[PDB]
Amino acid sequence: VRQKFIIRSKIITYIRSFLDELGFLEIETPMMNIIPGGAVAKPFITYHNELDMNLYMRIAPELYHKMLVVGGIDRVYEIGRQFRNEGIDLTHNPEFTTCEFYMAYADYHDLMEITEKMVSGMVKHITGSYKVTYHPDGPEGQAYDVDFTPPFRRINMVEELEKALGMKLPE
Amino acid sequence: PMYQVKPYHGGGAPLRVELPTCMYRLPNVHG
Amino acid sequence: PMYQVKPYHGGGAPLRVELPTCMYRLPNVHG
Numbered sequence: 001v002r003q004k005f006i007i008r009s010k011i012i013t014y015i016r017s018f019l020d021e022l023g024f025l026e027i028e029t030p031m032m033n034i035i036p037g038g039a040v041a042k043p044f045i046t047y048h049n050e051l052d053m054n055l056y057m058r059i060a061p062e063l064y065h066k067m068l069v070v071g072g073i074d075r076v077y078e079i080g081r082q083f084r085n086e087g088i089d090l091t092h093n094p095e096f097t098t099c100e101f102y103m104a105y106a107d108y109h110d111l112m113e114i115t116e117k118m119v120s121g122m123v124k125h126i127t128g129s130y131k132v133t134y135h136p137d138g139p140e141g142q143a144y145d146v147d148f149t150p151p152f153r154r155i156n157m158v159e160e161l162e163k164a165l166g167m168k169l170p171e
Numbered sequence: 172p173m174y175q176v177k178p179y180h181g182g183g184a185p186l187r188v189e190l191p192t193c194m195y196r197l198p199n200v201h202g
Numbered sequence: 203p204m205y206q207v208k209p210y211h212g213g214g215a216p217l218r219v220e221l222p223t224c225m226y227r228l229p230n231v232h233g
């Protein structure tokens with residue numbers, strides 16, 4: 001158990017190092033909003049005494065980050081808690097931690113390259129190799145080695161779905 | 172001088188090919 | 203001074219992450 005939380009800490013520290021070295025500014029944006037945004041989710045509601053109004057716990061920092069880019073801060077990131085008032089299951093908790101970053105003058109192609117580099121690099125640094133064993137159904141089920149060796153496979157949603165369905169979708 | 176014939180590249184402007192590119196970097200503020 | 207505890211990053215060397223990269227260029231010999 002200790003070892004899992006050490007790994008978790010190493011993941012976060014790795015990401016900060018990666019983003020810092022690329023010139024990103026670590027920022028903190030409001031966790032309480034007049035209007036929650038930046039994602040699709042049910043928000044938490046609370047009452048603020050000083051302003052005598054209800055506020056919503058953030059579901060994502062996205063809109064604040066983009067306003068700061070407008071502000072002229074070209075590269076920003078935030079690793080912090082988000083709150084979504086939905087279901088609890090094996091991959092969902094109402095409060096969870098995310099990293100978001102925003103990069104002026106980049107497009108999605110750039111971010112795929114950066115994502116491959118960060119994630120593969122992280123996995124190799126932390127585990128010693130690109131291949132990780134995982135039990136998707138727990139120790140009573142089968143395990144699989146997951147290969148983080150870059151580049152990652154790419155598929156186009158509509159294209160691949162149409163192929164898997166054996167039919168064309170309406171535009 | 173022999174009569175003028177425009178170059179086959181059109182004559183508008185010198186060929187300017189699209190070249191490979193590399194996302195610029197900003198320095199670590201902490202460094 | 204409180205007793206020594208090695209950092210969780212191992213203590214060997216400062217974290218050195220793999221960063222994105224860009225193939226270098228040589229100049230046009232004709233330019």
Ligand SMILES: C[C@H]1CCC[C@H](C[C@H]2Cc3cc(O)cc(O)c3C(=O)O2)O1
Pocket residue numbers: 084085086087091092093094095096098
């Ligand atoms: C910011 C997003 C980007 C995509 C991955 C991940 C999705 C996120 C969704 C999500 C929703 C939710 O209600 C509770 C949760 O624990 C998660 C989660 O851990 O993963 O983080």
